Amino acid sequence: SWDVIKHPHVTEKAMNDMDFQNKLQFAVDDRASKGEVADAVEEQYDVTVEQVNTQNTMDGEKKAVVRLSEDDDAQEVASRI
Amino acid sequence: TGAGTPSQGKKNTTTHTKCRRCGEKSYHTKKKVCSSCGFGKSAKRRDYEWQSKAGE
Amino acid sequence: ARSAYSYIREAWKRPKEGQIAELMWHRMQEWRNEPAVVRIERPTRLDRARSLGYKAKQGIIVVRVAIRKGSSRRTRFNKGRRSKRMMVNRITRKKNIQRIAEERANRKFPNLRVLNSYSVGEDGRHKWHEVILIDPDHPAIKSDDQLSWISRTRHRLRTFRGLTSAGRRCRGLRGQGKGSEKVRPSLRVNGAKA
Amino acid sequence: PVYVDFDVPADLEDDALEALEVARDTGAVKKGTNETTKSIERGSAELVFVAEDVQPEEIVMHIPELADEKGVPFIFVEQQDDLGHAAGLEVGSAAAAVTDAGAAATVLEEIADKVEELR
Amino acid sequence: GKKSKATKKRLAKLDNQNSRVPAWVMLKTDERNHKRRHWRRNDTDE
Amino acid sequence: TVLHVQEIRDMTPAEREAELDDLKTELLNARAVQAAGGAPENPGRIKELRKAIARIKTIQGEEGD
RNA sequence: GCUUUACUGCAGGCUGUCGCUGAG
RNA sequence: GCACGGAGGCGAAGAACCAUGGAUUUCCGAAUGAGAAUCUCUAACAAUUGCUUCGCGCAAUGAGGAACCCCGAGAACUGAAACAUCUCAGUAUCGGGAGGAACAGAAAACGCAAUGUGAUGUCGUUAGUAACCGCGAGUGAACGCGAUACAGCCCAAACC
Ligand SMILES: [Cl-]
Ligand SMILES: [Cl-]
Ligand SMILES: [K+]
Ligand SMILES: [Mg+2]
Ligand SMILES: [Mg+2]
Ligand SMILES: [Mg+2]
Ligand SMILES: [Mg+2]
Ligand SMILES: [Mg+2]
Ligand SMILES: [Mg+2]
Ligand SMILES: [Mg+2]
Ligand SMILES: [Mg+2]
Ligand SMILES: [Mg+2]
Ligand SMILES: [Mg+2]
Ligand code: NA
Ligand code: NA
Ligand code: NA
Ligand code: NA
Ligand code: NA
Ligand code: NA
Ligand code: NA
Ligand code: NA
Ligand code: NA
Ligand code: NA
Ligand code: NA
Ligand code: NA
């Protein structure tokens, strides 16, 4: 069985979203919906996912831009990995 | 109008595409039939004996 | 004493006489409104079926098949042909109608195999034959010492290879002597000359 | 139908089947067209039953004339399974033969009469 | 033109297959990409 | 390596599942560190983490969970 | 390739006959 | 792994490597819930069948494979120094189907005519013999014989 989350998509633009918008970007399996991406994320990092935007990339993978609630801090969640 | 060069310009149509069945770019997307494996016309795969010399 | 069957046979020797004559006139009317392939619970010619291998048992099916009469339905040539081959009207197929029937029937019952077939009359344009088919997968047939041979893999699609009754006869394999030089052991092996 | 030239009233039929059941217990009866046919031929048949719902009709066609030129009396039953059940079979039967009735040779003999009269 | 998720995947593979043999392979093999496809000079399938 | 077959079988169905979800996370964090061009790698393990996971799964099937 | 009262045949059309087809 | 780099790792808890057996085995694909250029939409043997507890409950078929095999359809160039029958040829090619081999097979046979042989293939021969044929060009067996291998049976019906 396939896993929802593949790995954190870390790039300059990903950083800006994390520092400035409290958003975490991930490389997720392309068969995963926004909702699945949401759950998986909350469960894996114990946070509150507010919104998820997806985009099927020219790399063959799906990218997910996940925004965490003001309650959580992306910068911190990402720093532990 | 020349049937040559000047008539080559209008060729922006898509027809034969990658066949889901045999992987060749011969799936005619208007016909929904593959010119190579026959997918969309035959359950059995396309094959003829003239594809090779009679005695081989 | 004469078997009850022997009567069924006697009657069919002259299908245009007496009672059976009026039976056909009756039936055919219903037959002509029936399909190409219709399964029937009981053989119209009991003696015949049983004689061929029929048994009122599980896994044995019988069906009546309608085939058009006449020569081959042939399309005229669309390119160069020498006179000899410009033929259309008088060309007839090398497979008799009964054998076509057997095949049509068999295709309608993909899992079953043809055991044998017989005629059941004909009007001005049809020809009806009844085909006996067998379910080589139903035990009772797998366990029948008189038919279990048809369950063998070597018999998959007997009709299509002419391993049938009419199949072998149509292939000119009746005689064991003179005349069968190009027939046995197979038309194809004899270069197709009979 | 083609081998049926006279119609047997519902009631007559009942007296017939009734006699058959006692026949199987008191006398002797033959079940099945083949066994029936041999009776008419071997003369051992007193009364023969023939269904009217037989298909194909060939299985029975011969009974009538066979019985007429053998003197053996015959009667028509409407239902095939009633003949069967009556003969004591769990299945149906196309034809039956009462080979020497039993505690019914009377009623029977008279049914044969009723039919002869039924033309 | 409007491409589908499947198409996009293929074009994607092709782009990847369009990278060069890594330097390290050269050394590991003591010593060419015969599948180099230019977007203008070459033509993909479908 | 650091995780042998005997040891996987000496676990209870609940211990393998616990060990499994454990390795998956090590792996997942391994990949994150790799995704961030992280050099504190030790390639021999990110590879092992995949094999350990296979074995555990293999055993889960053998034992019936 | 084409043509025709070139040679030989082949479709097609018309027509007689048989089978389907029975009562006075 | 090919693949001889860099870093790192595995192996005496006997790895690598080989054999057999087993696990896993995405999507399309006969492709079978429905649709679709390998993706998508809301429980599925789709379709045709057999049995049937008449419920997809139990089963079958589908498609592939180097050719070989069996059943159907069936040219023309060419040869005849033209060409029409004839020949190329039942070839090329096409439709349907089986197996590991197929097909054939235990005489309504043969017919060295016999006081004889004795299922069937195949091989050698019989023989370019007999037979065909604008009796042109061409076409072309069989019985038998010598070998190979051998194997002989089951229904329908009569009587139950
Ligand atoms: Cl068959
Ligand atoms: Cl001899
Ligand atoms: K010719
Ligand atoms: Mg979008
Ligand atoms: Mg032009
Ligand atoms: Mg690039
Ligand atoms: Mg599908
Ligand atoms: Mg010519
Ligand atoms: Mg010539
Ligand atoms: Mg052979
Ligand atoms: Mg000449
Ligand atoms: Mg010849
Ligand atoms: Mg001979
Ligand atoms: Na990636
Ligand atoms: Na079949
Ligand atoms: Na012939
Ligand atoms: Na291009
Ligand atoms: Na011309
Ligand atoms: Na595998
Ligand atoms: Na199935
Ligand atoms: Na069902
Ligand atoms: Na010449
Ligand atoms: Na010429
Ligand atoms: Na000739
Ligand atoms: Na001799």
Domain ranges of chain A: 1-81
Nearest residue, CB atoms, E13 vs list A56, A57, A60: A60
Using DSSP's 3-state secondary structure scheme, residue A13 falls into helix
| Structure resolution, Å | 2.9
Q: Nearest Cα to A30, choosing from A53, A9, A60? A: A60
Q: Where are the beta strands (DSSP E) in chain B?
A: 16-18, 25-28, 33-34
Rounded to whole angstroms, the distance from the CA of residue A26 to the C1' of nucleotide H32 is: 38
- Strand G lies under 7 A from the Cβ of residue C87: yes
Could you give the CA distance from residue B11 to residue B22 in angstroms, rounded to a whole number? 26
> Which CATH number belongs to the domain containing residue F43 in this structure?
1.10.287.310
Nearest residue, CB atoms, C42 vs list D3, D38, D56: D56
Q: Within a 10 A sphere around the Cβ of C127, how many other Cβ atoms?
A: 20
Range of the domain at F60: 1-65
Strand C60-66 relative to strand D29-31: parallel, antiparallel, unpaired? unpaired
State whether A30 and E15 contact (CB < 8 Å): no
Alpha-carbon torsion (D5, D11, D13, D16), positive or negative = negative
Could you give the CA distance from residue C138 to residue C146 in angstroms, rounded to a whole number? 14
The token duo for A7 is: 């790995």
Could you give the CA distance from residue C129 to residue C164 in angstroms, rounded to a whole number? 14
Domain D1-119 has CATH 3.40.50.300: no
Q: Taking the domains of chain C in order of start, what are their residue ranges?
A: 1-194
Q: Which of residues 129-158 of C touch strand G (CB under 7 A)?
A: none
Q: Taking the domains of chain D in order of start, what are their residue ranges?
A: 1-119
For residues D62 and D95, is the Cβ–Cβ distance under 8 A? no
Could you give the CA distance from residue C60 to residue C150 in angstroms, rounded to a whole number? 12
Residue that is written with structure tokens 């977007």 in the block: E39
Query: Closest nt to C28 (CA→C1')?
Result: G20
- The contacts of residue C64 (CB under 8 Å, 6+ apart) are C31, C34, C37, C38, C40, C44, C120, C128, C129, C130
Distance of alpha carbon F30 from the chain centroid: 12
For residues C113 and C158, is the Cβ–Cβ distance under 8 A? yes
- Strand G lies under 7 A from the Cβ of residue C40: no
What's chain A's Rg over C-alpha atoms?
Answer: 12
- Strand G lies under 7 A from the Cβ of residue C78: no
Amino acid, res. A77: V
Q: In what order do the strands lie in the sheet with D95-98?
A: D29-31, D95-98, D47-51, D74-77
Method of determination is X-ray
Domain A1-81 has CATH 3.30.1700.10: no
Residue that is written with structure tokens 């009850």 in the block: C4
Query: Closest nt to C76 (CA→C1')?
Result: G11
For residues C67 and C126, is the Cβ–Cβ distance under 8 A? yes
**What topology is assigned to B1-56 in CATH?**
N-terminal domain of TfIIb (2.20.25)
Give contacts of E45 with chain B, Cβ < 8 Å: 17-18, 25
For residues D4 and D16, is the Cβ–Cβ distance under 8 A? no
DSSP B48: -
**What topology is assigned to C1-194 in CATH?**
Ribosomal protein L15e (3.40.1120)
Q: Nearest Cα to A15, choosing from A24, A6, A7? A: A24
Rounded to whole angstroms, the distance from the CA of residue C179 to the C1' of nucleotide H145 is: 22
The token duo for C57 is: 């048992």
Using DSSP's 3-state secondary structure scheme, residue A28 falls into strand
Alpha helix stretches (DSSP H) within chain F: 5-9, 13-35, 44-63
For residues D19 and D102, is the Cβ–Cβ distance under 8 A? no
Q: Taking the domains of chain B in order of start, what are their residue ranges?
A: 1-56
**Is D2 an 8 Å CB contact of chain C?**
yes
Amino acid, res. A17: D
**Is A30 an 8 Å CB contact of chain E?**
yes
Q: Give the closest-approach CA distance of E45 to chain B in angstroms.
A: 6
Structural domains of chain E, with CATH = 1-46 (1.10.1620.10)
Could you give the CA distance from residue C23 to residue C10 in angstroms, rounded to a whole number? 15
**Is C133 an 8 Å CB contact of chain D?**
no
Rounded to whole angstroms, the distance from the CA of residue A12 to the C1' of nucleotide H96 is: 66
Could you give the CA distance from residue F61 to residue F56 in angstroms, rounded to a whole number? 9
State whether E13 and A59 contact (CB < 8 Å): no
Q: Nearest Cα to A45, choosing from A16, A22, A76? A: A76
Rounded to whole angstroms, the distance from the CA of residue F62 to the C1' of nucleotide H22 is: 10
**Which residue has the least CA–C1' distance to nucleotide H29?**
B21
State whether A60 and E16 contact (CB < 8 Å): yes
Amino acid, res. C100: I
